Design a protein around this ligand. Sequence first.
Ligand SMILES: O=c1[nH]cnc2c1ncn2[C@@H]1O[C@H](COP(=O)(O)O)[C@@H](O)[C@H]1O
Ligand SMILES: O=c1[nH]cnc2c1ncn2[C@@H]1O[C@H](COP(=O)(O)O)[C@@H](O)[C@H]1O
Lengths: 410, 410
Amino acid sequence: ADVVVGIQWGDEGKGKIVDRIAKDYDFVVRYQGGHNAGHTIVHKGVKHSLHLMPSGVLYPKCKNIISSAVVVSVKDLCEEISAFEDLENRLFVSDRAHVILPYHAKKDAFKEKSQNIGTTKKGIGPCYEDKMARSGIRMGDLLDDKILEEKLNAHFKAIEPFKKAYDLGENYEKDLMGYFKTYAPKICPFIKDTTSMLIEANQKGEKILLEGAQGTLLDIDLGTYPFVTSSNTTSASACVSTGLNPKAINEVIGITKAYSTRVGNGPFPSEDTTPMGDHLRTKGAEFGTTTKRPRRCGWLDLVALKYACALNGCTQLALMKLDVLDGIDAIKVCVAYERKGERLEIFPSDLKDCVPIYQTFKGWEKSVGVRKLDDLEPNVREYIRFIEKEVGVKIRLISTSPEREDTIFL
Amino acid sequence: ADVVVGIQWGDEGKGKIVDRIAKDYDFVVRYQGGHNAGHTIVHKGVKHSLHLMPSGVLYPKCKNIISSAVVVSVKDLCEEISAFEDLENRLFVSDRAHVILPYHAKKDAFKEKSQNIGTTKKGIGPCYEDKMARSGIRMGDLLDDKILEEKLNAHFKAIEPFKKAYDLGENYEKDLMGYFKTYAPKICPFIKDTTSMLIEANQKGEKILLEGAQGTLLDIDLGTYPFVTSSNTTSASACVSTGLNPKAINEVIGITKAYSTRVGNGPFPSEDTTPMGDHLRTKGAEFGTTTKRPRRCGWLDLVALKYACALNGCTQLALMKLDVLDGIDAIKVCVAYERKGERLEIFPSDLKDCVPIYQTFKGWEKSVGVRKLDDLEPNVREYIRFIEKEVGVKIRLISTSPEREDTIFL
Ligand SMILES: O=c1[nH]cnc2c1ncn2[C@@H]1O[C@H](COP(=O)(O)O)[C@@H](O)[C@H]1O
Ligand SMILES: O=c1[nH]cnc2c1ncn2[C@@H]1O[C@H](COP(=O)(O)O)[C@@H](O)[C@H]1O
């Protein structure tokens, strides 16, 4: 099995790379997160905004899997399903994936008043909380009316002391009953034991691509906690909860933008709020669309990249959004941190007082849409070579625009 | 890095195997769970009851690591630390591990009134809940009085509406302040960035042993949910949260008892409540000591074993507690399930109406303390051979009593 993983704080370009290579795989598997993910595939001037739908959906011969560590907003997933023809037999949703309830998004908003993490306010965290509580509802529950009713009733009981605090409606109970009345018939044909499916595919030597969401530095354990998502985002998470074991992992493709972003609060050593960063904001704070909040912008951070590569075991890198840097006078790369006079070469567990140490590179003018290594400007290849060498992982994919085919393979 | 993983519902004998092989490793790493784990190492008539302390502690040249996905009861860990000499420089606690507060155990007991999972009531789940909430306190917070005070104050505020429901004292706040006043000085010298430590050890080719707790069928995602623990228990979890990547995983030793137990509620297809199971209860419901609740007893379940082996990528098996079966007339093995007239060879996501299909084997009389394959009774080796063949993983270790040296290597 191969893994595509974001090695920054999300928005690296994972959906484009998965869609570009999905043709070579039998399965494409979203293994964690929910519809907090939000990215575009672009091909021939048509943009597809996916949230939980795996990025193999444009290849009807692929089987797309939503795995067990995902949290599922059923209504939103049904809305994605309606945009494609004949998804039956090529989309499967784990019967062990957990179900996001409307209360989860309301709890998310309420806790954000004091915590100010900058979540997507979609109830991701509170759904994972109920999973840990082992009170959460799972997709398999929807296949049996009696089971779902019993679990909903337990939810209504447990939720009573919170109706005021979380501003739950007077008709919360009645409305949620009708919610599942509407959406359970729509989603139930897609619910499957995807763990058995992938165990068998791996045993048979079928080709499996694992599609990460968010990014390594958003990992609940190893990211910039508390400014993280509530799931594990690295390659090992792909084979925690799919049914695949760590021995099954072959290629690990680390997706990184040629610069850095994060959306939401939290530390960001290479953030650039000076006029040197203004080009990044013009061309790259609005990560296309599908993403509403503007991204904080900064430079590539090799300290953080090397940390993420070690966590994932990246065997190759994809360098993305080179076109965003077209026309910039100069590009900086954070090669180390300065903390109270000490030079740090290694990503620390606390980024307090970590000041970026930069090397500056010449910019370039016209990478956009280039499809051949030969046609790139020297300054582009010099940048690529520096990153590879410093990080010790070969850049095997270069993206020069959102379009599927604007991708160079090495 | 090598992994020792329980492939049943815990209590398989992981601590004994880790202690037996720890001499060959530079690091021994507890990577998830907390002091819900509870096992004995026995050597020369001395029993050591460990809970969160890694099972390399009896080899002073080993470095024991408590990794980032663990939840730490600080008081209880300090009590384990006091039982050993000169643990400084050979025990390290991740600065990212999360901290169990007294409220967590009270919440655990309160939710158990309605959920009846059968937890250890030690606050494991509620600590993981606060981790998902990203409100939880982490061990690194204890290194800075101001940070800890700020996070405690936020906890006291957030905990106010629950003081009655969870029966928190009138002095909860004052008592928790004094708790950390007492225990933070004791534990702080052990707090380290263990992620950087293990990344570096792996890069340098040092020898790392990863020690699982609970067992595969207790995995929060893939176990018998909701009758599971709130952490991921498989080999992939070891390299989700240590800093090690899946490519680093080499040997995966699946620990299984020669029969099955679970403690707490939940499905158990090969449970035997008939007189045939009474020998198991006499010699094996009281898993030595360190464990208070009696275990439910049943037979080895190859359907579940094959599932767990696939999830972990086991390269070898350890077959444990053979002495418990000494004197039993006959041993049954569950080789398949019957569900409404259908024979199942593969572990399903719902065990409802799954009835064990058994094969019966001749018992044995005197495996206890045997140390050589040649000295075992034929009936023992026939049992071992059947399991190996059916599961397709070689049994490389055989345990014939709790004693470290009562272990056969093949
Ligand atoms: O897909 C994403 N791209 C970028 N950031 C994300 C994405 N999903 C979640 N996050 C960030 O992860 C953190 C937690 O948000 P949550 O996943 O909604 O809990 C916040 O900083 C979010 O902005
Ligand atoms: O170390 C253990 N051995 C056996 N069962 C365990 C162990 N730790 C937790 N469990 C079980 O895991 C489930 C959840 O308990 P918790 O880990 O205390 O939440 C219950 O069935 C417990 O009995």
